[PDB]
Each structure stands twice: as C-alpha cells, then as structure tokens.
Amino acid sequence: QRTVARDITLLECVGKGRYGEVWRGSWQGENVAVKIFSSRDEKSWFRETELYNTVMLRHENILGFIASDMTSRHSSTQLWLITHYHEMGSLYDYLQLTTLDTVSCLRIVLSIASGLAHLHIEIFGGKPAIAHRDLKSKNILVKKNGQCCIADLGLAVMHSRVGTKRYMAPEVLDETIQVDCFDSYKRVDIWAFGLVLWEVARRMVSNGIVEDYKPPFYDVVPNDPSFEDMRKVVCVDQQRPNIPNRWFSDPTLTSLAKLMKECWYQNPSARLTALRIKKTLTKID
C-alpha cells in the first residue's frame, strides 16, 4: 500500500553540549536539523513532544517542527527531534562576525517579537498561551530572508532543567516569581527578550560606530555565572545593561534603548507585553 521512508542521513554536527547534539541531516534530498538528546535531558524531548502533540504550532518565526522520534536500542532509548534547518545558524553565532544596518536590525527584532507574541497569545477554536522560559540568542535562528525564528520549547509551559541563568529575570533569581500566575512566565520571557534586543542593537552601525558582540552582563559576571553572581547583579544592586552614548545620536537606537528599558522593570507587571513591543517596533523608522 505505501513505503514510509524514515531514513535520515546525518551529514555534519552543527552543535554539541550537555543537552546532546544537533546535526544537519538529509531526508528525501532536503536538509533537516536533528537534535539527539542526552539521557540527562530526556525531559526536554518529552515536553516539546507533549506540546506539539497538543498544538501543532505553525508560524514563520517559530522553528518548524517535522518529527519527534523515539527508537528502542539494545540498552537505551534514543530520542530525536527533527525540525527545519537554518543554514545561517543561531543569532548568537551570526552577531559575532556580522554588523547590521537599521533595516536588518529592526527586521531581526520585530521577527523575534512576532514569534514571541505568537507563543504568548491564547487563540480560541487555536492554541493555548505558551511561555518559552529559555529565550536567548543561542535559541534564535537566522533565516535567509533576514527574519529569525525561536527554537527549543523543552522548558515551555502551556496555559488556557531551569532557564539560562545569565538571562533570568530578577523574580526568578530571588525566587519571588508568582508561580501560580501564568502571566508571571510571560513577563520572565519579556525580560530575556529585552536582553536579546540589547545584544542585537549593539551590532547595529550608526555614524560609523558599532559595539563588539558581548553577552548580557559580560562586564559584571563571570563566564557560567552562578545563581548568586546573577542575583547580586540583578536583584541586590539592580544593574541593567549599559546603553552607549553613541545610541542617542541615532533615532532607531534611541527608540530601541527606550523599549529595552521597558522590558527590564524590577516590577514584572510594569514590563511591556510582546504585542505592545511589536506595535512600538512597527512605528520605528
């Protein structure tokens, strides 16, 4: 009645960590991305699989799902997540070398805001509201058309492993987050979005000037900062990323500085919503 061609050829490893590995693969002559999970991070595969079994997200700024595969091995279970492949790689990767102009900077950040607002919004008929819980530049991929997409729903929570410590909001670091209020999780994503917006804005040229790529808080915490390192910076001293003087000569960067400030309020309920961020970004330039 029909052949079901399941063979995926793994061609090149494009990422390896404690999570496991990501591979460029081939299925029926087309590139796919294959995430192979470590034993240590099986729950990330289960959570993303459970979410996609609940709602088949389809959005230009969400990494495109293809498949979740569990295969029985002699002494172990093998877990793969198969997605669209974005050959330009992560935003983290891309910003290291590349500088941006006004149009490319805005296109990047508005595409991220678009993906994030899609996750956050409940649609009746539709989708549950979704918070990401690990938004960062390594979890955003660059597409050839200049838009980005959001990746890795292994920590996501639906309404109707913990986050990367460098990007944790103050209420996560001081353990005051209202864990029974779904809006709490959206506001944690907004904080992290503001940090990503800062990372990208630094790489936008104005008046012949650009900042070097740096991760958020590069100047105040070590590599692999501890919870305590982050809590002292963000909660106790209430530091925020630096806005360089040169941004205030450029109307786009002046507007982006204002926006990122309104993602970083200590009071989570004062932060902008993803929908409000989108509207603000459509009115810039």
Ligand SMILES: COc1cc(-c2cncc(-c3ccc(C4CCN(C)CC4)cc3)c2C)cc(OC)c1OC
């Ligand atoms: C099991 O595993 C994998 C399967 C595949 C795959 C390969 N060929 C064809 C298919 C297919 C799709 C859909 C139908 C429909 C047709 C309409 N009818 C009314 C209901 C059924 C049938 C067949 C699939 C799903 C790829 C994989 O990897 C890319 C798989 O591994 C994860």
Ligand SMILES: COc1cc(-c2cncc(-c3ccc(C4CCN(C)CC4)cc3)c2C)cc(OC)c1OC
């Ligand atoms: C998993 O991913 C991929 C899958 C496939 C693929 C392979 N065989 C059959 C199908 C299919 C056919 C028909 C229906 C429907 C059509 C309308 N109604 C009658 C209900 C049933 C569904 C599915 C697909 C989608 C191709 C892909 O790429 C070209 C995939 O992407 C990598």
Ligand SMILES: COc1cc(-c2cncc(-c3ccc(C4CCN(C)CC4)cc3)c2C)cc(OC)c1OC
């Ligand atoms: C963040 O997380 C996930 C990401 C991906 C993913 C999807 N497309 C492309 C990539 C990629 C491709 C290529 C490079 C390099 C190699 C060549 N060049 C010299 C520099 C660029 C880097 C990255 C990835 C890593 C898939 C995932 O799941 C299957 C992820 O997990 C949810």
